[PDB]
Design a protein around this ligand. Sequence first.
Ligand code: CLA
Ligand code: CLA
Ligand code: CLA
Ligand code: CLA
Ligand code: CLA
Ligand SMILES: CC1=C(/C=C/C(C)=C\C=C\C(C)=C\C=C\C=C(C)\C=C\C=C(C)\C=C\C2=C(C)CCCC2(C)C)C(C)(C)CCC1
Ligand code: SF4
Ligand code: SF4
Lengths: 731, 165, 35, 41, 52, 80, 64, 94, 143
Amino acid sequence: KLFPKFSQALAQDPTTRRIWFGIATAHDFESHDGMTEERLYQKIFASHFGQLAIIFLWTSGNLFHVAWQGNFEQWVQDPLHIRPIAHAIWDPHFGQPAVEAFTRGGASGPVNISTSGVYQWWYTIGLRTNQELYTGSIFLLVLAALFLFAGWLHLQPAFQPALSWFKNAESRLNHHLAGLFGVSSLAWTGHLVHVAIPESRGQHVGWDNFLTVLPHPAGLTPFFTGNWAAYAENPDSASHVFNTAQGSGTAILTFLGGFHPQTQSLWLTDMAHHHLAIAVIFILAGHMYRTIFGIGHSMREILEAQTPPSGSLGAGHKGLYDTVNNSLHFQLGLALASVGTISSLVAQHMYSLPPYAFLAQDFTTQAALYTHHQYIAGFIMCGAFAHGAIFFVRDYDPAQNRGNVLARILDHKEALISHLSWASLFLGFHTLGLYVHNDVVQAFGTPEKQILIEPVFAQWIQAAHGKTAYGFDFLLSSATSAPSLAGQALWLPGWLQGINSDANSLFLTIGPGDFLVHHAIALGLHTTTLILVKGALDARGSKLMPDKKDFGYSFPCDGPGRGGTCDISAWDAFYLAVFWMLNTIGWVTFYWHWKHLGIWQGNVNQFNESSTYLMGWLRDYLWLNSSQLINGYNPFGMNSLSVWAWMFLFGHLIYATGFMFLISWRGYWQELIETLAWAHERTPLANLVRWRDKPVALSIVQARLVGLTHFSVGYVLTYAAFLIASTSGKF
Amino acid sequence: DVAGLTPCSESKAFAKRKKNEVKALNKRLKNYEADSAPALALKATIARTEARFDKYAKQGLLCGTDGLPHLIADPGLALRYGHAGDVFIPTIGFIYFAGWLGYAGSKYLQAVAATAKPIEKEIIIDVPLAWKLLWEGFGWPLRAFAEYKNGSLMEDDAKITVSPR
Amino acid sequence: MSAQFLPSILVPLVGLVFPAVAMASMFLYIEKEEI
Amino acid sequence: MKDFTTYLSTAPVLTLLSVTVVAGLLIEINRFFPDALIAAF
Amino acid sequence: HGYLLVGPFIKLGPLRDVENVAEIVGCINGAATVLILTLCLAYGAVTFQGEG
Amino acid sequence: SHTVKIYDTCIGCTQCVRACPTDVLEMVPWDGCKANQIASAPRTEDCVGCKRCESACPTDFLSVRVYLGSETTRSMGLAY
Amino acid sequence: PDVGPKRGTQVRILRPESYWFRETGKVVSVDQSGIRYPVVVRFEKVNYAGVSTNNYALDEVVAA
Amino acid sequence: KYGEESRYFDLKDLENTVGSWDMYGQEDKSRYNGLQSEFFERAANGLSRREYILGLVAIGGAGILAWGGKGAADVRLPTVGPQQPAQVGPRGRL
Amino acid sequence: AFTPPTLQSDTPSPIFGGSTGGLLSQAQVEEFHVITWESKKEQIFEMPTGGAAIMRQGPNLLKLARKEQCLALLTQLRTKFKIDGYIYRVFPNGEVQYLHPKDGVYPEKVNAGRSGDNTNMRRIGQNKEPVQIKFSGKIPAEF
Ligand code: CLA
Ligand code: CLA
Ligand code: CLA
Ligand code: CLA
Ligand code: CLA
Ligand SMILES: CC1=C(/C=C/C(C)=C\C=C\C(C)=C\C=C\C=C(C)\C=C\C=C(C)\C=C\C2=C(C)CCCC2(C)C)C(C)(C)CCC1
Ligand code: SF4
Ligand code: SF4
């Protein structure tokens, strides 16, 4: 009866809704009984330590499983003909053909073929042996234990920091930029130069001999005399072979750009140079704000001074420092927005500029990594907007935000929502109309009547990069231009060789189907932003419900009065926008996967004349690439793709089980549960036992969340199964 | 050649596509007698296909890797290379016609809003008034610009409902 | 793969023993009345 | 016929006749001017 | 109930087609008795912690 | 255990009291409106949260506001 | 003396929480007994509940 | 109850009016015969306490783990048997 | 002053055939409500639990699982029969609490002598902002 000790209101519920909401309100510390702000922030800090320990344990487990059951030794010697092994399989449900079908990469028993790209990353950063991976796993185990001890320690009242320490923004930014960002990047440069650079050239460097091996034959003296160009003397040749000393070099900070010819990945010396420059700039950035040494910035005064005259922004940024600092939800929204955008950047960059050795030959790994980071980015961006809506519901003070840009953007929120609606409506109308017109003219036997708008602007920017394929001869595509001549002895040769080659993903050739799918992506982003922005801006109140801020961020409705108030809270707007995020990321990853499937087969045409109409999308992509997937098991037997077929049907089942909660609502189920309670309360031989908690139907918000969770899980599992099966079974 | 595209008058794959379509229609032909109604229908379809392909080659459309016409949606890039009819001229045409329809509907709204029962006039449409305003909406751009310069096109924000933030 | 017996013990431990004990423990704790 | 013409002026009758005449005009435009991909003057 | 649960595992278990099905089914039923036993344990511990 | 509140915009039309299916609302004497009566909620422990009172309030915006809160065996409307 | 706007005049609602905020309404009656919201304002535009009249105070209503 | 006519409520006899009944439970001392009752209470003697009936589940889980240690292989089971060649893959891999 | 009427336990019940929607296990260990009304003739009404019942001449006694069922029966008696009634809350320990016509007259009619609680003297939009009551365990409207 006293299980939700954080919420005595929930503990007095004599139903199963008590435990259901006890699970789901456990991390809403602000809503907990007897919660001060000091205890809030200290709990936040300790939970952060727990999360860091969890992440470190997870990567240590990856290292230990690859070192213990993987084929890292065999993969290092033959990176292009050995399947990386994730972990061994011990499932007593396997029949004998399942045991044979899962024994693949030279292992003793059934194993899972890794698609996470940890093999390429660890091989690139200089890890060569299973002993090194085990040492890394043990070190991460110890450091996660240390972080757990720190989380315990800072909850103790002798070591609990003050609330003002948590809100010390200038110091936290200074140390994060200078130390967490800068010093870490400098240390990664040190690892790359000391370990990864020699291990890329067949020279083993470890803790036993890194103090007796010289990273550059002219040690430190060029660094200290300012002759820094001596660290970029002889780069690795185009004939260089990875992990061997054949045609290597001595330079540690090259600057050639492009890709390594053998690994089809970026130069490691380029990475060391990049990380060193990033470390310098981030340490400088961390020397910006004022702490205790009489120099630096007060960010409050910077926000005060950012008020343009003539009342263009009203009061400008009056009191935004306190608005951000007092609100944990504002900070969490900013952090989630930035982190989701960075995750999208990571997805968009690692496929086109492959960083790790022998990446972009493992086609399943690239597709899986891209789709993973894109889905993570979409979820995190929805979380950013949801926490912005929470900040409007909870932490927004109109008095201290009077005249500043927040009050201005809340003042004319109808214009923002209406213009997002106009943009989404235009994009949906036009993209769907062009697609349906193309479908109809394709069906009627007239492909020449298609509307194929050439993406001339994106092709123009591609030409500005040096892509001499559309004949613009603009900036970098003309060698006579000032940017072309400026770095022609710098990054221009390698970058131009990468940009003019059709064998990589460095800015692929685009056509009308790319135009149509880019407008589809624009429609998805616009509509998801419309739902999320409308939910945030209408979170405090609307015309249908003026006092919405009093009812909280999440609540079922306001009853059937005033015409009906279903899905009126900002939580419901986030709920509706998660579907649109899933649809948008589905479009993005469908586009990426079909384009790269055309590229990897050498048949760019299949996408070029099949993406302009939707029947080509359904038939030449969804229907065609699922043939090996659905034959993972059959009456004639089974093979290694059986797990992805089972996960395919599994995700379909979870998706429709989500539809169950999505369509049916709480009222039929409550009557059914009452009828079954009547049945059990007077069934003979079962009246001996009775429920401690009264069985009730799931609440409206709870079942909306459950249906959304099943929808997302089925979506993700289905697409992951299809993508990994259709790429790994084919390549 | 505006973006690596070749004109469909000289692109080989356009002629190949036209030949394939005509050959498929001839394969359809080679089953009926010469003067039957299906024969006349297929002959008309063939004539329409050849006319369409010859017109597309005549109008100066751009073909990509294969023989499919591509449209240019950049002013200047389509103006100086003679493809303003791809997007720009239909852009002007749609803007004019949509403005005509929208201005006619707007003027109907403001005409029936100042009547005895504006509620009834929107389900029971005054047909002569609608016809007159549809005719008057052909001068929509000049009327709209005049009302914008007069300030009578937009409404002051102090007379428009908003939510209580 | 060294120590092949260890998955054969650990997988039932985290699939049957630890989950059954955790589910029983949490079921006891959610209805502890007076913790 | 005042009530009959008022019924003809009702929103569904007028919108069905209007979409009918617009669709017929577009259909006869495509009948006499088929396969107009661009606005070539 | 223990004499009840033998039959489904005998005629239908994964090792139903081998001679030693009886012993393996006895083991399965011992495990089933143990898990139903801890179900009774948990029920009696949660519903009889006081008086009414 | 639902929070039901009455506000001074109430005109004393007694429609919220008539709409209540569990007898939560009642009319008490008042001097702030023409009808000389305002609504009151002395029995919010019997409130299920159906918001039928809100559906009957003619004041814009409504004067009988129901805030769903803690759930009991009577707020959940259980017969078992 | 009579208080509030005259009967039948044109008034604008200044209650930001009302449906007809900054809209057009006509005064039907103003009570002189001392009602907290004596001004009765009728609108041609109905709200979500379907009513077209509402009671307002004195400082949330300006004429014309 | 006092249901001699149509009166199904009584505050002095509120037990029967509420609906609390035995349905089928009846009180009787006679059921099981001699010696076997003592046999079974001796069989389930000290085990009646919650901690020892928990320890029975503990040794049951020990048996669950003993199957994995030595018991899965005694009934063969494909997850611990041997393997027969391998497959290459789509392209030149392993 | 007003005094509540006593719940006369030995009161006849309406003629009924027995339903499945009646009392359950909640009545024994939490609560069951009861409604009493005076009928002027033998006539058929509708049960809140489903089915038709005949209430008899004079006093009629009916116990129901929830108060909402009692008020549904009372309002259908008041509309389709013009019959008033009394509802009582009966605890299993024996204590009986009077319920709906608490002060004699119906709640939709004023009585002059009631408690006017939960009546705020402000408007809807005059509640406090949630940031000004942050970390309090109360909604803005109960300040
Ligand atoms: C130089 C001193 C210093 C350093 C090193 C740190 C370091 C850290 N602090 Mg701390 N802090 C400091 C000073 C410092 N702090 C001071 C002075 C204060 C008081 C004003 C605080 C107050 C404070 C609070 C309140 C909290 C922290 C927290 C944290 C942790 C952040 C979470 C994390 O690990 O993500 C790691 C971040 C990065 C790795 C940056 C990466 C940049 C982007 C996101 C990724 C891109 C990089 C690259 C492309 C990825 C490639 C890797 C891939 C190959 C695997 C982190 C270890 C949080 C915490 O977790 O609690 C323990 C937290 O709650 N700090
Ligand atoms: C740094 C990330 C971060 C952090 C710290 C928070 C923190 C918080 N969030 Mg938030 N959120 C985030 C990201 C984050 N969020 C993201 C990315 C999203 C988009 C999905 C959301 C969307 C969101 C919403 C809509 C809400 C919150 C809420 C909250 C607050 C309470 C949390 C809670 O409800 O209890 C604990 C939360 C849980 C126990 C999550 C439930 C479990 C999920 C739904 C099911 C997972 C099933 C799993 C995937 C199945 C495996 C599949 C396999 C079996 C096949 C809390 C302060 C709530 C709030 O503010 O209260 C008003 C609120 O309603 N968040
Ligand atoms: C594929 C999605 C899906 C699934 C699985 C279900 C499943 C179910 N629905 Mg449902 N429904 C759905 C979609 C779905 N629905 C949608 C989209 C709607 C909207 C129109 C509805 C609307 C609806 C209504 C109105 C009703 C149901 C009812 C039911 C239940 C019927 C009882 C039954 O089938 O017996 C058996 C259960 C199953 C077949 C489900 C799968 C169980 C598997 C096959 C076996 C279990 C083994 C398990 C996985 C092992 C445990 C592993 C452990 C680790 C957890 C059942 C659980 C009815 C009900 O309440 O019960 C009568 C009811 O009236 N549904
Ligand atoms: C002639 C009436 C009329 C006019 C002038 C407008 C004008 C406008 N609408 Mg609107 N709209 C209308 C009717 C109209 N609408 C109708 C009937 C609907 C219901 C389907 C909508 C639904 C709608 C939505 C959901 C949105 C707009 C939006 C907008 C604005 C963006 C531009 C646009 O074209 O969006 C697109 C307009 C449409 C998709 C609807 C067009 C429907 C037809 C073609 C118009 C009606 C013709 C009318 C019967 C002619 C009468 C002739 C007369 C002589 C009797 C704009 C000012 C957007 C906005 O808010 O921008 C900020 C927006 O989000 N409209
Ligand atoms: C979070 C990281 C993680 C994950 C997801 C897994 C997952 C898995 N491990 Mg593994 N393990 C890990 C870390 C991890 N491990 C680490 C760091 C070590 C070094 C000590 C090991 C050592 C190890 C061995 C020796 C074996 C496995 C095995 C397995 C497989 C079956 C589970 C099992 O029976 O072993 C149980 C796992 C452990 C006893 C240690 C795992 C402890 C992790 C770090 C807990 C992390 C929990 C997480 C942070 C929060 C989740 C909430 C949770 C506490 C409820 C399974 C796929 C077995 C296998 O190979 O299958 C074929 C096997 O025999 N693991
Ligand atoms: C709800 C809400 C929220 C949230 C929001 C969000 C979510 C936002 C966002 C957003 C985003 C997500 C954004 C993004 C961004 C970015 C940007 C805006 C940028 C930029 C810049 C530029 C201009 C660039 C340029 C360039 C290029 C183009 C490339 C190359 C280089 C250069 C530099 C040249 C908050 C909490 C706050 C508050 C409350 C409410
Ligand atoms: S929500 Fe329903 S039960 Fe509660 S006061 Fe309003 S009408 Fe009565
Ligand atoms: S319905 Fe509204 S206005 Fe009428 S008495 Fe109830 S609270 Fe007052």
